[PDB]
Design a protein around this ligand. Structure first.
Ligand SMILES: N#Cc1ccc2c(Oc3ccccc3OCCn3ccc(=S)[nH]c3=O)cccc2c1
Ligand SMILES: N#Cc1ccc2c(Oc3ccccc3OCCn3ccc(=S)[nH]c3=O)cccc2c1
Ligand SMILES: N#Cc1ccc2c(Oc3ccccc3OCCn3ccc(=S)[nH]c3=O)cccc2c1
Ligand SMILES: N#Cc1ccc2c(Oc3ccccc3OCCn3ccc(=S)[nH]c3=O)cccc2c1
Lengths: 425, 298, 509, 396
């Protein structure tokens, strides 16, 4: 029995009360049989009719706890995100300890038990409705995931502290454990973990492991099979985003600029075909090696889409990503790169825990010019030069219509000003 | 004894996100946190508490020491009117144009209500583990008004010192003259020992003014802003009402630190201003440069 | 013995040829296993190396699947295939369905594979199962039966099923056999024993032509859940709708919220989505709900709490539609054959109110033609005289079917009746706010409108006002009752309680 | 012996979705189409061929019968341009100067000619079903289409033989064939013309051809429009005059409006003369009371609603240049009045010139699409813009 956390209703609020609607004879019979199974297993309790509180209840039974969720202390939000496959350092062994009814296992304190009520009607109108309460952690309650996560963190403390080498990632219910130990020793450790979590009250799958659009392989992380499909444009942009992590050079600009349902534009077919051509090839990404250093790259797959590639050893990519310069206002190419650079450093600090050494097309003189003439103070941590086909700079070199006469003397849709600039340069 | 200090009526609790930090920083923060837990000053919080305050790490003069400065703006803003009324420390007039504390705060107990509000969280790299979170069971270092609960004990013993020499008066915004600075250094050393006992040109003329363009009352909005018209030009403006008066990021932040101190001296409050550098870009490097508990409004 | 439709490639396009990317052995076991079973069934047959056509296979295992399953991306053959007729995207609306004593649901099994394929296009549907270490060329296969994912496979199956059902439908007139994508929904007015005999007879006929049928016990129970509608015997109800209560709303989440609200608008009256949709004006980005928007969400939830049911169409009576103005720019309509029982309920979302009424009548009659086939006997808020006034004066043709007036608090009316004739015993005013008058008192679209307004209040009850901007003329002549714009609201407000006001345009000279 | 039919080079087939129809229309279409399939003019098709052209059902002659008007305009735009130069159809200028012109329907005779097997697929009609209960029955034309341009082209060789004796017997009668309609024009009196019309009908029935609505040419003259001469001058009237004079300036140059403008003299009471200004008005009155037709360009007929049961039609080849202008006085529902106006405009254009004008109909798209079929009695279907959204009307 995990130590029960104190849960307090929101001050100035009272327990929820909702009416119940009857259902079909087969449905209610199945539901009451399910409840009988729970009671014989002691899973739920039968609250008295004296309790004023109520909550709607609808073989899967769904409880709309939104009324109870209206009155509950805010709980700490579970850390939102996906452990990026690149951040996983290579472990000689891997496991999955999929736990069943993990949310169900957590108990609930006495005060908040009464505020959860369930009214399942009775056939022949013997009772207006059978009244129940959850003695376990309810589904969909605001605090169900956070309380469970904190309880798990407390529950695994004896095992993780003793062993520093073993690394255990926790996500939702499941537990992901990596060991550098041999298969024999690891069998002992996995048995200890299983018996320990069973001691506190809480058929294995086989490699390879695929999850959350992230196919995982010992020396390589590759996305799930990506196939290109208003909602169609939504799906098309969404698929390219998840494919942009490992398939370098994915272009999404034309769709974002594009968005009765209009069809794909004339150039949309060709751009989607280019994306499909890049998608055809199988690409993958290596898990980062702690001993060596992270290196970053920057290149232009297309204007408005600065693509960057974090690589540990050349020609092998740890990850690839896109920065959308076209989204938002058009700026100086060096400024576009600065925006991209900040994007890269945020990703680098969250995923790997360190800043990378950036190899960028912008020349050292050009970056120095950007520093000299700009109003913001944005800075790039590490500057290295790499030759790439697209190399960009600034044009000016640092309603007054006579400016056009001066030029004669020597939106992304408009380029007549660019012709004027070509005459200027 | 313990004096209750509360949030303003109809005010929600303090909740802000922890900007992810580098690994070298998190190592030092976790080691200092576990040390403090061994001392007993900080204790864990369950999932019941909804308050989260940001934790950043700073090192002073390459001393190989990093400190757990906690951005207390939100909770301090929430109880700001409360700490001022219960205890007042107006900034002295002599300090303007004049011709350390907080270590003992660890001994002070804290009331239940504010203790539960001050909750700091250490991050996790790549979401390896749900981040450890704590609560301050002793006096925090960074709450405006945190000195006030323990202010009486220090000033009551600082007064005998001030009895011998009236030249120096000290304001306590957070836990942190006429006498010749060398002689004042001698006096400061003796005071430290005492603490040990305690425990076109015409157009340019018009252009110059255009180039410039581009007493304290508690009810005044005194704003000090640091602007750099490029690396070459730096514009240092302070204002009360509108129209009325090297790493680039490091320069901006250090100048901001200095002007925040200047505003604290003259007006007893940290100025409220917006950074010219992009706030995301600022956040990438804000942690390195500030070296005091004082936190600008941003 | 089903006949094979003549299917050909698009003229001038060679047969597509694709190469399979390597795949891990654990997959290459399940795929070869399922292929061997298919060969036994006759659905797939081996192809010799002479055929030059090959397509890619990507193996996918669904959630809670023990064995990895086969997916063939026939997109290359889809790009190159004779265009086929498109199956009707619309599904039968429950309201149109007449009540019959017994309705039984039959689902044919492996429907695509029961249909045979033309000999010509059997060859093009060929793929190479992946090979490991290049030890063998790899097993290569072609589909005798229709492929799933092909462009025209649903159309060919639809034609096959339609032709198979024609002998049964001709022989039995009472039975109505709706056809969904893969199921036959059968209904008769006969007694349930005779009906059961008829359904088993249909099963035997379909099996004679090679399409499997569900067992008598396995046929679905009387309450049916289909495409978001629960079709109870004497009522149709939209499936239980749950509204998320999350504090921060993703743009995707707001889209889903609007989708669910529109889904439940067909049976739940007065669901307002215009404000939420206005808030929808990065997909992850969150928007703070206006106080108006959260009030709208709250009243929507209040409606959603109670259960509502609609009734199936009965042929004898006559459909009657009543339009009610829920709000400015929003209209709510109910289609009821008998009072207090609604076949369906709809919402029209949007400048004169009677013009919007005309648009709403058009939408209602289009929907009624699609579903029931007869335009309703409309019941509308506006009175007869105002409708006659709008018909004779409007610039564009307007027609409304037979309409009988009903009295509701929010009647549809024109707030001001402008003057096209100059009025005697009145002062004429010229407006640039010029406010020039016959007395001589004196003082870009916004300027032209606001000058007219300032003249209106300055003028008094009766006046003649001239302006050179057709924008102002259009604003006034349109007679907006919505008054969405504050300036426009000012002009409209001043125009209301006046005996006569004449607006005119002077050509520039 | 099927005449070769081919699409215009590089042209795709018809793919147009069928509008939903009232239940009675669908039942009538089902019965008529079943009889036609039994006879053999049409036959069912499967999903192999993805071609569709719309079907509509119209009542005829105010009689208890339902006639089918397949909208073959899209297939016309593709094949008729190819066939008109290939086969051709002359236009007689004498039809517009006859005393009386009648119209007859020669549709039934088109049911005998067979159609090339290659072009059969491009003509397919789908009869829709209510509530999407069943896939719509799809048929195709195995017999010469009725109401498709080029049916007169193919049947012209037979028709010239059919009408040769009647033309040889009577030189005065003048005949033109356009989309199943035969136009008989004569300078004889009404009683004289009707007997010969009966003669031609009997002649058609003698040869096996199976086959009213008299239009009187030379009874139509372009209506001049003159602003009324004011017995007493009125300022509001003067402003209306100057606006209409500018509009007429766009139509006909040379009008001088300044004289009325000077009389306005800035600020005056809206309710309240110079001889020279009067003289200007008289000369402009007579003046108000390009003309040649480019065969390649397509006529556009613009309809303006003056209200109170009156409509005005301007048939013009190019904007601002009007080939004919008239006012349709109307005896109801606005849709029926617009439909009668459209039919009269088209039938008047056909006599004067070959083409049927493209219509700028003043009605919202949904209302026209929903209500046009019931009030329509003419086999030909004009090409129309469903709506001109802005009023686009000067003061009038
Ligand atoms: N489904 C599922 C699933 C399985 C394992 C996961 C995972 O594993 C580790 C867990 C803990 C430490 C290292 C880990 O792995 C790094 C190295 N590594 C990576 C992959 C493989 S297959 N083997 C291997 O050694 C971390 C995060 C999510 C996981 C999800
Ligand atoms: N995001 C998202 C998403 C999810 C499902 C999709 C999909 O499935 C169904 C679509 C319709 C009915 C059943 C389906 O299947 C079970 C539902 N289900 C759920 C999760 C997963 S990962 N897969 C899956 O199939 C078809 C097409 C796109 C889909 C997108
Ligand atoms: N899942 C599923 C499912 C089940 C039936 C459907 C359906 O049924 C009919 C099919 C044919 C005639 C009438 C029908 O139903 C009218 C209304 N109705 C409804 C229920 C009862 S018990 N009786 C009754 O009359 C039509 C369309 C889709 C369907 C989907
Ligand atoms: N196209 C499509 C599509 C999308 C979701 C479907 C669906 O939801 C899931 C139910 C359970 C797990 C995952 C689900 O889907 C992924 C996440 N998710 C959840 C809810 C919604 S509305 N959309 C969504 O993407 C169940 C069955 C069919 C679905 C089809």
């Amino acid at each position: 029995p995990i130590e029960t956390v104190p849960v307090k209703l929101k001050p100035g609020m009272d327990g929820p009360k909702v009416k119940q609607w009857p259902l079909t004879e087969e449905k209610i019979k199945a539901l009451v049989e399910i409840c009988t199974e729970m009671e014989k297993e002691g899973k739920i309790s039968k609250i008295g009719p004296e309790n004023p509180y109520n909550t709607p209840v609808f073989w899967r039974k769904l409880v709309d706890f939104r009324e109870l969720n209206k009155r509950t202390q805010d709980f700490w939000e579970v850390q939102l995100g996906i452990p990026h496959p690149a951040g996983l350092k290579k472990k000689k062994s891997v496991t999955v300890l999929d736990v069943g009814d993990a949310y169900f296992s957590v108990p609930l304190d006495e005060d908040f038990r009464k505020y959860t009520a369930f009214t399942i009607p009775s056939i022949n109108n013997e009772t207006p409705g059978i009244r129940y309460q959850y003695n376990v952690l309810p589904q969909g309650w605001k605090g169900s995931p956070a309380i469970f996560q904190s309880s798990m963190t407390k529950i695994l403390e004896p095992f993780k502290k003793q062993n520093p080498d073993i690394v255990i990632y926790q996500y939702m219910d499941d537990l992901y454990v990596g060991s550098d130990l041999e298969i024999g020793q690891h069998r002992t450790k996995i048995e200890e973990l299983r018996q320990h979590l069973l001691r506190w009250g809480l058929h294995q799958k086989e490699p390879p492991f695929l999850w959350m659009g992230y196919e995982l392989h010992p020396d390589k992380w590759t996305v799930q099979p990506i196939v290109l499909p208003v909602n169609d444009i939504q799906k098309l942009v969404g698929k390219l985003n998840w494919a942009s992590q490992i398939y370098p050079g994915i272009k999404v600009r034309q769709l974002c600029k594009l968005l009765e349902v209009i069809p794909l534009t004339e150039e949309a077919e060709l751009e989607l075909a280019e994306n499909r051509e890049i998608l055809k090839e199988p690409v993958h990404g290596v898990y980062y090696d702690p001993s060596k250093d992270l290196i970053a790259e920057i290149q232009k797959q297309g204007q408005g889409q600065w693509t960057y590639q974090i690589y540990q050893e050349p020609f092998k990519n740890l990850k690839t990503g896109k920065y959308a310069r076209m989204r938002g206002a058009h700026t100086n190419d060096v400024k576009q790169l600065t925006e991209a650079v900040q994007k890269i450093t945020t990703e680098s600090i969250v995923i790997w825990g360190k800043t990378p050494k950036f190899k960028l097309p912008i020349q050292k003189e050009t970056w120095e010019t950007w520093w000299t003439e700009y109003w913001q103070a944005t800075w790039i941590p590490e500057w290295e030069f790499v030759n790439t086909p697209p190399l960009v700079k600034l044009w000016y070199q640092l309603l007054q219509a006579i400016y056009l006469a001066l030029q004669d003397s020597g939106k992304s849709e408009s380029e007549l000003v660019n012709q004027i600039i070509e005459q200027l340069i």
